[PDB]
Each structure stands twice: as C-alpha cells, then as structure tokens.
Amino acid sequence: PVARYPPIVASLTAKSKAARQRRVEQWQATVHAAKSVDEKLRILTKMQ
C-alpha cells in the first residue's frame, strides 16, 4: 500500500569515485563500530 524505494547511495563494487567514497565510509563505520581504543588505533594505523 506504500511505495518502498531503495536508498540512492552509490554502488559498492564500482570503480567510480562515489564507490570509493562509499568504501571509505564503510571502513570508517567499521572503525566507529570497533569496541576498544586499541582495536580502533590498530585499524586506523594498519595502513602503511
């Protein structure tokens, strides 16, 4: 009875800069969902 529309967010596996930004937001959300500060620091600094 009510129209249900999917979100207008960009794709996740695409090559576009919007997709790259979505992946960046995904890993930042993973950092947010991390519980301990040690895990947060490990995720934030695991890239070299």
Binding site: P1, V2, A3, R4, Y5, P6, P7, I8, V9, S11
Partner: protein, 153 residues
C-alpha cells in the same frame, strides 16, 4: 544446431550477458536514447519493452520494485522509471521503443551499430525514413484506384 533459440551469446557468458544488458538498460533509462551495437540494441529491445510493462504494474508492486532494483543499477532512476516513463506510457500497448540502424562506427572495427530511443522523449527527432507523399505519380494512381473502389460501393 541452434534451432529454436531466442537469446544470443554476448559477453563472457550468461551472467556477463545479463550484466551487459542491465548496464545498457540503465543507460537507456537515464538518457532516454542510446546507441550501441546492432545486435546488443536488438537484444535490449525486448528487455526495454518488458521494463515499461513492469513499471505500469504500479509502484507498490513488490515484484516490479525488486525487478527495477536489480536492473536499474542507478537507484535514482527507479523513481524516474515509476513516475515518468510509466505515466507517459498508458494508452500505448507495445510501441514503447524505436530502433534504427545507424552507419558503421568510424573506428577501425567498422561494427554494425543501432540506436534505441524511448518514444516521447525530450530530444530532437531522429531522421526517420518518411514515406513518399500522396502527390507522387504511383501514389496518385493508387489514390485514383481507391476513389474508384469507394465509388463502386
């Protein structure tokens, strides 16, 4: 032996063909008129005709909604599909798309290319092949035949 076959082989397989057709359909929905290979456009014509019929089923139809979600990769086109193309295609039964063969691409491949266009779009009309006017010699002779037939009854 390819007797009784309606789907042609494209891409790297069935799933690759489905993805290519989905991308072409998304582009066609977004731009209201696209040009591609003649075989690809001919294959996409059926899916384009089916998509309009699915959209005409209503916005609240869950099957149509999920079909649009699968096909239209750009989710901003689904509201466009359900609120522009479907409303403007109501009395039309199957005349939703127009396909015309264009000259070969200037690239060295020299591929056979076609152009597909949704009717009633906000784009300049294509150079459609128009029939000869009734003022021609043969057309006027046929008009005379028609007048004689009408007068005979």
């Amino acid at each position: 032996i390819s007797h009784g076959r309606v789907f042609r082989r494209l891409g790297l397989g069935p799933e690759s063909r489905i993805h290519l057709l989905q991308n072409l359909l998304t582009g066609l929905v977004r731009h209201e008129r696209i040009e591609a290979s003649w075989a690809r456009v001919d294959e996409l014509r059926g899916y384009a005709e089916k998509l309009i019929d699915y959209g005409k089923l209503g916005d609240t139809n869950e099957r149509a909604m999920r079909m649009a979600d699968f096909w239209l990769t750009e989710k901003d086109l689904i509201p466009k599909l359900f609120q522009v193309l479907a409303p403007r295609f109501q009395g039309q039964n199957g005349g939703y798309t127009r396909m015309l063969q264009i000259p070969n691409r200037n690239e060295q491949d020299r591929a056979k290319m076609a152009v597909i266009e949704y009717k009633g779009n906000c784009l300049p009309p294509l150079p459609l092949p128009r029939r000869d006017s009734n003022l021609t010699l043969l057309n006027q002779l046929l008009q005379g035949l028609r007048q004689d037939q009408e007068a005979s009854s």
